[PDB]
Amino acid sequence: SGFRKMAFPSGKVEGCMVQVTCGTTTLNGLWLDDVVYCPRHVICTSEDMLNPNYEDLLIRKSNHNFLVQAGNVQLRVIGHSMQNCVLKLKVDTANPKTPKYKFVRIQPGQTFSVLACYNGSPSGVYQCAMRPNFTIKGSFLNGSCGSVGFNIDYDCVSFCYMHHMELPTGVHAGTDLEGNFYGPFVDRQTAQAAGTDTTITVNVLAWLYAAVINGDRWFLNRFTTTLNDFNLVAMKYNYEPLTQDHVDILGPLSAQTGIAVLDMCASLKELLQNGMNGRTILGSALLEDEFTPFDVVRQCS
Amino acid sequence: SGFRKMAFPSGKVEGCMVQVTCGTTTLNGLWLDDVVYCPRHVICTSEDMLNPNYEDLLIRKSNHNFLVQAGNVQLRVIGHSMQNCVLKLKVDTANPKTPKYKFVRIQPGQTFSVLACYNGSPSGVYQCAMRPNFTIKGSFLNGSCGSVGFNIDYDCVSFCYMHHMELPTGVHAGTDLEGNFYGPFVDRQTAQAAGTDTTITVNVLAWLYAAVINGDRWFLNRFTTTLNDFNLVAMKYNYEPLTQDHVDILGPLSAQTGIAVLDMCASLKELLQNGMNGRTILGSALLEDEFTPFDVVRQCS
Ligand SMILES: C[C@H]1C(=O)[C@]23[C@H](O)[C@H]1CC[C@H]2[C@@]12CO[C@]3(O)[C@@H](O)[C@@H]1C(C)(C)CC[C@@H]2O
Ligand SMILES: C[C@H]1C(=O)[C@]23[C@H](O)[C@H]1CC[C@H]2[C@@]12CO[C@]3(O)[C@@H](O)[C@@H]1C(C)(C)CC[C@@H]2O
């Protein structure tokens, strides 16, 4: 029993992390087979980051301009190319610790583990959600850029995030591993701001099922509601609409606890309208939305 | 910027995790050099766990009774001995992935990373604190026993916890790696219960400094207080007394933010007496006590 914000074991990713240096700019790279992936802004100086032209900046660079260190061992770069907002540095040596991996783009509402790194040195691991507004609420200091987000299915590492920048509200923006940004963000330090965020309704419902399975029952009631009447309430409290697929996805958890999805929706309506009254759910005094139905089943089955 | 409950990278520990089977009982072991460490109750059946005599149970066992699998490879056990509540199984092969390590016993109030494992297979990593009552609030299902807690200093793994049992309130009890239990708990499924817990005052203060550094300032005030007058309030709300060493340990954080320790104590007094008023601190609606001064400096420096 018990429920914690749990990250995937980070070992398989730790063995892929390297340092990439161009001039006086250094950040983290991902070394898979004979390619190192890193943010393209590694070729920018402090001045350039205002408004760079990356094609012009890259054409003026050669292989010897890129320093790659795999811990102590320096890797000889034998090729460079730009793919969207990521740089691909072809190197001398194939990473002998290269795991089975895929590059997958995730959806808002889905979770992943972040291995925060500094100068190619792993510092810590934590669980994130992709916010509805395509930002993440991470923990990143200067030199954390190139740090990756990932899930592990069996022995396969699904890489979904590379960290690029911090936004004005202190939230974080990055790309998939093909170098395509999540949300309407660009790799220049300018006047960009996160759009209005919403609460991930299906995740909050999954978390209430986790609470029931772990013996927190106080918020349950005899009432039920309709998907329409619930969605009217959701809109008012800045929650995402719930769909038939959402209730279908919550089916297994519904069956395990014996509480119908629309019954649990009735509980959420009451919690939104009334609050908690000095009471807690799984050691929290607010409604948690960074656990997916899968995350709950994983930890509570 | 940003603040997350961050675990240490788990790679160095992942490579030490094995499965130990005796009869129909299976759990996790820690393989360091040519020794595998596991809970001694692996030699107990469902019936024995009521009231076992481990000396009698072990004397009736031989090396061939212990099945150890390092993933696929089976390890030949060539010796067995009991050290307090842990079993030491001497094996054929020295673990080639054995990191630099120490066995350290931690204090109530200190934090560590847990690598939750099932049948010698790592499942996830999360951060814990040793509660004042020597329990931990972990996430453990059947087959999680033998899972270890640890810190990483430089390249050295300081192992501090091995998981043994779950208590009636759904909290967890275990030993250091010398097999000595944290708190007044024993390895038999009986009527044991956790003593009354308290809030780790110094940790809550460190977390308020983390909030200030990340731009949460609303709870600050012009007031200060004395260490005595604060400790009178602490006692009432079931907080641990604050000592001169606690304020000394908070010195660096005090200097970084320019808020005196006793000024921050005044803020905590108000938060305890008044509450938060629908407001949050670092994405929490209650006062968090599982971040040490070290944990904050680590993430906010
Ligand atoms: C790598 C990311 C990052 O961390 C950036 C951005 O959020 C993003 C891109 C650039 C840095 C940073 C500008 O702002 C940063 O937040 C900051 O950490 C960087 C320094 C320390 C001020 C150095 C200059 C540097 O331009
Ligand atoms: C390994 C720990 C553990 O997980 C124990 C205890 O908390 C502790 C020791 C024993 C098991 C468990 C008795 O209670 C358990 O909570 C439970 O998970 C175990 C089973 C699944 C019921 C099987 C029998 C077994 O006796």
Swiss-Prot record, chains A, B:
Result, substituting residue 132 to H: In strain: Omicron/BA.1, Omicron/BA.2, Omicron/BA.2.12.1, Omicron/BA.2.75, Omicron/BA.4, Omicron/BA.5, Omicron/BQ.1.1, Omicron/XBB.1.5, Omicron/EG.5.1
Effect the entry attributes to changing residue 145 to A: Complete loss of 3C-like proteinase nsp5 cleavage
Catalytic reaction list: TSAVLQ-|-SGFRK-NH2 and SGVTFQ-|-GKFKK the two peptides corresponding to the two self-cleavage sites of the SARS 3C-like proteinase are the two most reactive peptide substrates. The enzyme exhibits a strong preference for substrates containing Gln at P1 position and Leu at P2 position
Assembly and interaction partners: 3CL-PRO exists as monomer and homodimer. Only the homodimer shows catalytic activity. Interacts with host FBXO22; this interaction promotes the proteasomal degradation of nsp5.
Covalent cross-link (Glycyl lysine isopeptide (Lys-Gly) (interchain with G-Cter in ubiquitin)), residues: 5, 90
Active site: 41 (for 3cl-pro activity), 145 (for 3cl-pro activity)
Biological role: Cleaves the C-terminus of replicase polyprotein at 11 sites. Recognizes substrates containing the core sequence [ILMVF]-Q-|-[SGACN]. Cleaves and inactivates human TRMT1, preventing tRNA guanine(26)-dimethylation of tRNAs. May cleave human NLRP1 in lung epithelial cells, thereby activating the NLRP1 inflammasome pathway. May cleave human GSDMD, triggering alternative GSDME-mediated epithelial cell death upon activation of the NLRP1 inflammasome, which may enhance the release interleukins 1B, 6, 16 and 18. Also able to bind an ADP-ribose-1''-phosphate (ADRP).
Record protein name field: 3C-like proteinase nsp5
Regulation: Inhibited by pyridone-containing alpha-ketoamides compounds 13a and 13b. In turn, alpha-ketoamide 13b (tert-butyl (1-((S)-1-(((S)-4-(benzylamino)-3,4-dioxo-1-((S)-2-oxopyrrolidin-3-yl)butan-2-yl)amino)-3-cyclopropyl-1-oxopropan-2-yl)-2-oxo-1,2-dihydropyridin-3-yl)carbamate) inhibits SARS-CoV-2 replication in human lung cells. Inhibited ex vivo by michael acceptor inhibitor N3. Inhibited ex vivo by compound 11a and 11b.
Parent sequence residues shown: 3264 to 3564 of 4405
Regions of this protein lying in the Cytoplasmic compartment: 1-301
Domain Peptidase C30: 1-301
Location in the cell: Host cytoplasm; Host Golgi apparatus; Host nucleus
